[PDB]
Amino acid sequence: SFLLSKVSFVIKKIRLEKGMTQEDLAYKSNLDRAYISGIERNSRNLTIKSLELIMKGLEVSDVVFFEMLIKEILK
Amino acid sequence: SFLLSKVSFVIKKIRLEKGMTQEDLAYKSNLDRAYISGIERNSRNLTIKSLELIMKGLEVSDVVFFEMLIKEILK
Protein backbone atom coordinates (compact mmCIF):
# COMPACT_ATOMS: atom_id res chain seq x y z
CA SER A 1 0.00 0.00 0.00
CA PHE A 2 1.33 3.42 -1.13
CA LEU A 3 -1.22 5.15 1.02
CA LEU A 4 -0.50 2.98 4.05
CA SER A 5 3.21 3.85 3.70
CA LYS A 6 2.54 7.62 3.59
CA VAL A 7 0.18 7.36 6.51
CA SER A 8 2.83 5.48 8.59
CA PHE A 9 5.52 7.99 7.67
CA VAL A 10 3.42 10.93 8.85
CA ILE A 11 2.40 9.30 12.09
CA LYS A 12 6.05 8.72 12.98
CA LYS A 13 7.08 12.18 11.81
CA ILE A 14 4.46 13.89 13.95
CA ARG A 15 5.28 11.65 16.92
CA LEU A 16 8.95 12.55 16.74
CA GLU A 17 8.07 16.29 16.28
CA LYS A 18 5.99 16.11 19.44
CA GLY A 19 8.85 14.38 21.42
CA MET A 20 6.86 11.25 22.44
CA THR A 21 8.18 7.68 22.39
CA GLN A 22 6.08 4.80 21.00
CA GLU A 23 5.61 3.67 24.61
CA ASP A 24 4.32 7.16 25.63
CA LEU A 25 1.90 7.09 22.66
CA ALA A 26 0.76 3.58 23.57
CA TYR A 27 -0.26 4.55 27.13
CA LYS A 28 -1.88 7.75 25.81
CA SER A 29 -3.96 6.03 23.14
CA ASN A 30 -4.77 2.74 24.87
CA LEU A 31 -3.27 0.86 21.89
CA ASP A 32 -0.49 -1.73 22.60
CA ARG A 33 3.14 -0.74 21.94
CA ALA A 34 3.58 -3.63 19.46
CA TYR A 35 0.59 -2.33 17.40
CA ILE A 36 2.15 1.21 17.39
CA SER A 37 5.53 -0.22 16.41
CA GLY A 38 4.01 -2.24 13.52
CA ILE A 39 2.03 0.86 12.28
CA GLU A 40 5.24 2.79 11.93
CA ARG A 41 6.88 -0.06 10.01
CA ASN A 42 3.98 -0.19 7.52
CA SER A 43 2.96 -3.59 8.92
CA ARG A 44 -0.49 -2.90 10.47
CA ASN A 45 -3.56 -2.20 8.39
CA LEU A 46 -4.81 0.57 10.66
CA THR A 47 -8.48 1.47 10.94
CA ILE A 48 -9.89 4.99 10.86
CA LYS A 49 -10.81 4.64 14.52
CA SER A 50 -7.25 3.62 15.41
CA LEU A 51 -5.99 6.63 13.47
CA GLU A 52 -8.35 8.91 15.47
CA LEU A 53 -7.01 7.45 18.74
CA ILE A 54 -3.43 8.01 17.64
CA MET A 55 -4.04 11.64 16.61
CA LYS A 56 -5.68 12.14 20.00
CA GLY A 57 -2.67 10.59 21.81
CA LEU A 58 -0.33 12.65 19.69
CA GLU A 59 -2.44 15.78 20.37
CA VAL A 60 -2.51 16.77 16.68
CA SER A 61 -5.68 18.06 15.08
CA ASP A 62 -7.14 15.85 12.35
CA VAL A 63 -6.79 18.72 9.79
CA VAL A 64 -3.11 19.07 10.58
CA PHE A 65 -2.55 15.29 10.12
CA PHE A 66 -4.44 15.26 6.78
CA GLU A 67 -2.63 18.41 5.54
CA MET A 68 0.75 16.82 6.20
CA LEU A 69 -0.45 13.60 4.54
CA ILE A 70 -1.46 15.52 1.37
CA LYS A 71 1.94 17.28 1.36
CA GLU A 72 3.85 14.04 1.75
CA ILE A 73 1.83 12.36 -1.05
CA LEU A 74 2.60 15.31 -3.33
CA LYS A 75 6.42 14.94 -2.77
CA SER B 1 -17.12 10.02 16.57
CA PHE B 2 -16.99 13.18 14.51
CA LEU B 3 -14.14 11.88 12.31
CA LEU B 4 -15.82 8.60 11.60
CA SER B 5 -19.10 10.21 10.55
CA LYS B 6 -17.21 12.67 8.27
CA VAL B 7 -15.23 9.89 6.63
CA SER B 8 -18.46 7.92 5.98
CA PHE B 9 -20.15 11.08 4.66
CA VAL B 10 -17.37 11.78 2.22
CA ILE B 11 -17.20 8.22 0.86
CA LYS B 12 -20.95 8.38 0.25
CA LYS B 13 -20.88 11.87 -1.27
CA ILE B 14 -18.21 10.91 -3.76
CA ARG B 15 -19.89 7.57 -4.66
CA LEU B 16 -23.10 9.48 -5.35
CA GLU B 17 -21.12 12.09 -7.35
CA LYS B 18 -19.68 9.34 -9.52
CA GLY B 19 -23.24 8.00 -10.11
CA MET B 20 -22.65 4.59 -8.49
CA THR B 21 -24.95 2.64 -6.24
CA GLN B 22 -23.39 0.68 -3.31
CA GLU B 23 -23.48 -2.38 -5.46
CA ASP B 24 -21.92 -0.66 -8.52
CA LEU B 25 -19.04 0.31 -6.26
CA ALA B 26 -18.75 -3.22 -4.72
CA TYR B 27 -18.69 -4.86 -8.23
CA LYS B 28 -16.03 -2.42 -9.35
CA SER B 29 -13.83 -2.91 -6.25
CA ASN B 30 -14.41 -6.64 -5.64
CA LEU B 31 -16.16 -5.96 -2.38
CA ASP B 32 -19.72 -6.70 -1.20
CA ARG B 33 -22.57 -4.27 -1.25
CA ALA B 34 -23.18 -4.90 2.51
CA TYR B 35 -19.56 -3.85 3.22
CA ILE B 36 -20.08 -0.57 1.30
CA SER B 37 -23.41 -0.12 3.09
CA GLY B 38 -21.81 -0.69 6.58
CA ILE B 39 -18.95 1.69 5.82
CA GLU B 40 -21.37 4.51 5.01
CA ARG B 41 -23.28 3.76 8.30
CA ASN B 42 -20.29 3.35 10.53
CA SER B 43 -16.63 3.92 9.27
CA ARG B 44 -15.16 2.35 12.56
CA ASN B 45 -13.85 -0.71 10.79
CA LEU B 46 -12.60 0.83 7.55
CA THR B 47 -8.84 0.28 7.10
CA ILE B 48 -6.37 2.38 5.22
CA LYS B 49 -6.00 -0.41 2.59
CA SER B 50 -9.77 -0.68 2.10
CA LEU B 51 -9.93 3.07 1.81
CA GLU B 52 -7.27 3.13 -0.90
CA LEU B 53 -9.15 0.40 -2.78
CA ILE B 54 -12.47 2.33 -2.52
CA MET B 55 -10.84 5.55 -3.84
CA LYS B 56 -9.39 3.51 -6.68
CA GLY B 57 -12.87 2.13 -7.54
CA LEU B 58 -14.42 5.62 -7.23
CA GLU B 59 -11.57 6.95 -9.46
CA VAL B 60 -10.81 9.77 -7.00
CA SER B 61 -7.17 10.49 -6.18
CA ASP B 62 -6.00 10.22 -2.55
CA VAL B 63 -5.25 13.92 -2.38
CA VAL B 64 -8.76 14.82 -3.50
CA PHE B 65 -10.45 12.55 -0.95
CA PHE B 66 -8.40 14.12 1.90
CA GLU B 67 -9.35 17.67 0.65
CA MET B 68 -12.98 16.91 0.72
CA LEU B 69 -12.53 15.35 4.19
CA ILE B 70 -10.85 18.53 5.48
CA LYS B 71 -13.66 20.74 4.01
CA GLU B 72 -16.21 18.59 5.83
CA ILE B 73 -14.37 18.68 9.15
CA LEU B 74 -13.99 22.47 8.87
CA LYS B 75 -17.66 23.14 7.72
A67 touches chain B (CB under 8 A): yes
User: Residue A49 CA to chain centroid, in angstroms?
Assistant: 12
Q: Are B49 and A47 an interchain contact pair (Cβ–Cβ within 8 Å)? A: no
Q: Are B62 and B52 in contact (CB under 8 A)?
A: yes
All structural domains of chain A: 1-75 (1.10.260.40)
Q: Given B45, B52, B66, which is nearest A1 (Cβ)?
A: B52
Chain A residues touching residue B43 (CB < 8 angstroms):
48-49
Technique that determined the structure: X-ray
Contact criterion met (CB below 8 Å) for B46 and B74? no
Flag whether residue B43 sits within 8 Å of chain A, measured between CB atoms. yes
Measured between alpha carbons, how far is B51 from B62 in angstroms, rounded to an integer?
Answer: 9
Alpha carbon distance A25, B65 (integer Å): 27
For residues A66 and A68, give the distance between their C-alpha atoms in angstroms, rounded to a whole number.
5
- Dihedral sign of CA atoms B20, A67, B63, A44 in order: negative
Structural contact between residues B11 and B64, judged by C-beta atoms closer than 8 angstroms: no
Closest listed residue to residue B3, CA positions, set B72, B65, B49, B57: B72
Alpha helices, DSSP H, located in B1-75: 2-17, 22-29, 33-41, 48-57, 62-74
Q: Determine the Cα–Cα distance for residues A33 and A43; give it in Å rounded to an integer.
A: 13
